[PDB]
Design a protein around this nucleic acid. Sequence first.
RNA 1: CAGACACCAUGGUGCACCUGACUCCUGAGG
RNA 2: GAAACCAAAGUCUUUGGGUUCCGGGGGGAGUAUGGUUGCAAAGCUGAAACUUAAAGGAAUUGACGGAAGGGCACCACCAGG
RNA 3: GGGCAAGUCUGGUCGCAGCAGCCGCGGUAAUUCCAGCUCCAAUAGCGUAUAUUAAAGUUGCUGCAGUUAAAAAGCUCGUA
Lengths: 59, 208, 226, 99, 57, 82, 126, 129, 71
Amino acid sequence: KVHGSLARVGKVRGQTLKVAKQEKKKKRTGRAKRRMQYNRRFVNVVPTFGKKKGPNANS
Amino acid sequence: SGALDVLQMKEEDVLKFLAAGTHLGGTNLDFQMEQYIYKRKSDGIYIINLKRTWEKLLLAARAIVAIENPADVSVISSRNTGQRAVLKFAAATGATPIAGRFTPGTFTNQIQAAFREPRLLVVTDPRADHQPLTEASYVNLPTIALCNTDSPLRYVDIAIPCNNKGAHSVGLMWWMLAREVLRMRGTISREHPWEVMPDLYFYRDPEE
Amino acid sequence: GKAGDKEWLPVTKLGRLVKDMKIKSLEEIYLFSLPIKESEIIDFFLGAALKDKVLKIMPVQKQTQAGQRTRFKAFVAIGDYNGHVGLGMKCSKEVATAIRGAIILAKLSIVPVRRGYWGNKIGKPHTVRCKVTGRCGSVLVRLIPAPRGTGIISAPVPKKLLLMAGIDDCYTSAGGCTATLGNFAKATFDAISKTYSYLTPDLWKETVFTKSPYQEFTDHLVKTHT
Amino acid sequence: TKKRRNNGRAKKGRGHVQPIRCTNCACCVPKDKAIKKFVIRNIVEAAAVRDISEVSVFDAYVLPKLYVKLHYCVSCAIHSKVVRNRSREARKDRTPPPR
Amino acid sequence: VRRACYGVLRFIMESGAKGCEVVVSGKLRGQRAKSMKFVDGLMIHSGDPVNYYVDTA
Amino acid sequence: MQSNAGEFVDLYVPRKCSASNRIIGAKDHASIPMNVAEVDKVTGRFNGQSKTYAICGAIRRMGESDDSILRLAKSHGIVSQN
Amino acid sequence: MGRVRTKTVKKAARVIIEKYYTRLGNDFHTNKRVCEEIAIIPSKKLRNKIAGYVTHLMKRIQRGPVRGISIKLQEEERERRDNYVPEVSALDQEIIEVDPDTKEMLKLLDFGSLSNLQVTQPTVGM
Amino acid sequence: VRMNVLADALKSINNAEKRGKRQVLIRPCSKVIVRFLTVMMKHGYIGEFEIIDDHRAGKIVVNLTGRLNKCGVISPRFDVQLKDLEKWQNNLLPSRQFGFIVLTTSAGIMDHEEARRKHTGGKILGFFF
Amino acid sequence: MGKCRGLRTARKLRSHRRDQKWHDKQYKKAHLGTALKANPFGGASHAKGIVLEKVGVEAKQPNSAIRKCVR
RNA sequence: CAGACACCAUGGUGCACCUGACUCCUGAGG
RNA sequence: GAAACCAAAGUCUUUGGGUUCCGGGGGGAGUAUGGUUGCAAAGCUGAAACUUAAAGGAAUUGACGGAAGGGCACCACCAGG
RNA sequence: GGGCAAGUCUGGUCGCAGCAGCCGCGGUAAUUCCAGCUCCAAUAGCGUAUAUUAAAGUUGCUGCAGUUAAAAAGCUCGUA
């Protein structure tokens, strides 16, 4: 409405803490990474296994 | 055409026509039947032109001919007066007969308790056989029909002027049709008229 | 595992002629302008290179006497990439059933779409010969031919239909309601079919008409009935 | 949209009309946008008449009728079932119940 | 759910049945309950012959 | 529908009409012709060789067709009592 | 009031009547036994309702064919009876009064006949 | 009353053609109507016409054919300098392979193909295809 | 449709379109300069100010939260 | 048709939910 | 034509006979303000801030009516216990 | 989460903190939050605010709508 009183702030962040996995490997740079996506998806393992499936899907 | 003198009519027909009360028509003005009319009787009623009735009947008959199986022309009447009429036609010519109720869907309906395969429909009044007339134009079938001056002309290809309601009018036209198709292709042959009388057709006529 | 099957049941002259191979293509049937009431005819002449795209799976409903009721309405489009396409709508109790029926309906309705050129005349048709418009519910889609290498410039739903149609190059403008998708596909379907309905001066030259396959094959098609 | 084509009875080819009144509800309503009802009825009805015909002497005369031209307004005419609700298809007919 | 139901339903019908029905009831998708009927053929619920003619599990 | 000097584009060539000069398109309903048998004349008895007229959806729904067929048939012959 | 016949009874009755016409009587008791011979009916109450309706039908039937049901032999008999000849067609009817325009129809077909003239009290038929 | 005469004639033919009707009575009859009909006739879009002569203004009976799909009128007329002809032709005709835009040029009422060769523009009357 | 289209009617079309343009809400607010006068953006894109006070705002339904704004 | 025709106000809420691939697999033989 | 409807609300993407008038989401509002006409009551011209993703039309299906024709039951009434 | 490309994620919270152009999430088994992990898109660039343009036939010259959705002056004469 209009009100005036702040109450609670950063409540969720006050009990969630971050952590890190570091690296086995670097996250790839430019041209090499762009090429890598096309090879990893298609020329491998030429696709014949599975269907209707995402790159991060649990379906 | 055919052998040719009796296909320009003859007195025998003109007597049968007058007797059966073909000649009288409706009192509704026309725009599609108008050409056919000979002259108008005083204070309404149209006198159909027997010359026109002939030519159309022959063109109709000819279309049934050039089919080597006469079964795939469905003769249709739902009128009482023409139930006996079509039954005799089917015996004679070899038509597949539909007397009494049509029962909707026999040229339509994949799942049905009856199906008929025609190629040409002959109708006795398309305002009583309206169900076949509508059904036929959903499945690409030509329809000849016996039409007066107040019958629908939509989805009718070839009309035959005639009263074609009640009495001996419906009977006689079935008799003359059967006679005509048998001339070209039958066993009357040589374009000369039938030895069967029109009285075998007509209505039942209440039996004493 | 699972495997399909096929069976032929004729109730009409046309089914018998197709299986006997006195008709070798749908084009003959289309020319004579006779209905197709058997899916098997389309399957027999083609049955390969037929892609079925479900355009939407959207549910609708009506209120029953006690609480709600709901059902699935499916739109399926079918077509080869050689100038033949169909559209079929079916509504059934479940999603799967609605699509299954829709496919059968889509096949049955298959219609030729004429393919022409922008201005060219050599190297085989890439578009349409005439601009064709179709309306559905106040949506109007206008297809305009486009030259080679332009590609299909259309919204996703009409573009898919055009692709199957064999129109690889097209300009479109659609006006009206854009929220409605069943209408949009239907209007494009009206437009593509209209190409045959246009009379071009290249199509003026006249013909002596069919004597009907029913009449000519009459004797052949006595099997137990004509 | 129009729920009655003639609006309860038309007034076309006429630019205005005078109002009539109701004969039992007295309320102003147009004359040809309201129900008009002829009432022809015997003077001695179906009631009185049975003893009036037997008791009469020196008489030979067929019974008089009372003639009154009633006018009803819409709200009263629906209510007491002079007219009553009907199908929307049936509305397109000008054909009324026979007398 | 639908794949499992269709396969079993189709197999039981194929064996020879006048008809059959499979119902899956309970919760799905969190906190709402649902039922589905996957039916084929003829089924009755009429009088005493139901007990005789139909086997249930 | 030709392209170039007379290359064939096209899926098929449709039927035409002469009762209104309008094509029968593409799978349409109420589109059928009408084979009238010829008779050889003089000795009677049907000999071939059909006269065919093409009837379109349009004419039939506008209730023209009856008159049209007669005009078409008469103009090219032949029926007795013309 | 209650226990009006159901479809199951009537269908069976039509069946039986057509194909066993000569065997069937008009008496409940004998017909009940005939229904055991010519059919398998899994209840006596059902068989009784069938048998019962079949007697009622036979009674109506033996006055000629009746509504909603026909027997093949009776259909043949009616067919043969109707050979009826009500004209022979023209009577002859030659040279009688005809309408003045029907007259010109005969006239220009090389006949003519006597014909009606004059109009008095139109509208005609009124 | 009539502020264009082309527009009435063109509609009249099209409405006849829809029916299958093979006659019209167009009027008031003018020089431009005659000229438009002849060019139209030559390409086969309509059949032959016959001008009946009266001292009113004349009346023409056109026997038409269904080889036409639409004869439109560009009312009010616009100037065309042979570099708006191209714009019109893509816009309002279904292809560049057929159909004519018919204009009036100082070298006569002519189809736009002939106009292009002459390189004489003028005022656009209408089109057909 | 409903417009004039003679051979001299340029002036009438030119002015009629201009007159009707003003009706539209999106057009009018911007062209009358209303947007600048009422709201501080329109004629600027970013703007810096001094904080007057910190406000808690007990957000109007739907959605139950304290939104929390500054003035 | 052509007997009688009366006061009566107020009141709240959520989850209806979306994909195709026939085995009890027979399991002496196979 | 979205339909209801409609021989015009037809001859509109195949878009164009002539001319005129009015509208540009819904509310604020025919309100504010200035002018004008009126003796008066009133009439005409006619804003904004702000508010908000629905306001609205039509048809469809349900539910409900102290709207109209109906039926059926001692969980309803009747006659009564 | 949808439009929208890519989580029927794992922990944490539980109509709280926040998210949210818009539609809407979060009231305990949150695929919208807060972190982590994974994946996507563009890639030495990318996000954001704002003016304007396109899409928009939502200003309709080309090319609008006005029976009922926003919209024919009460009606006629009549000069520009």
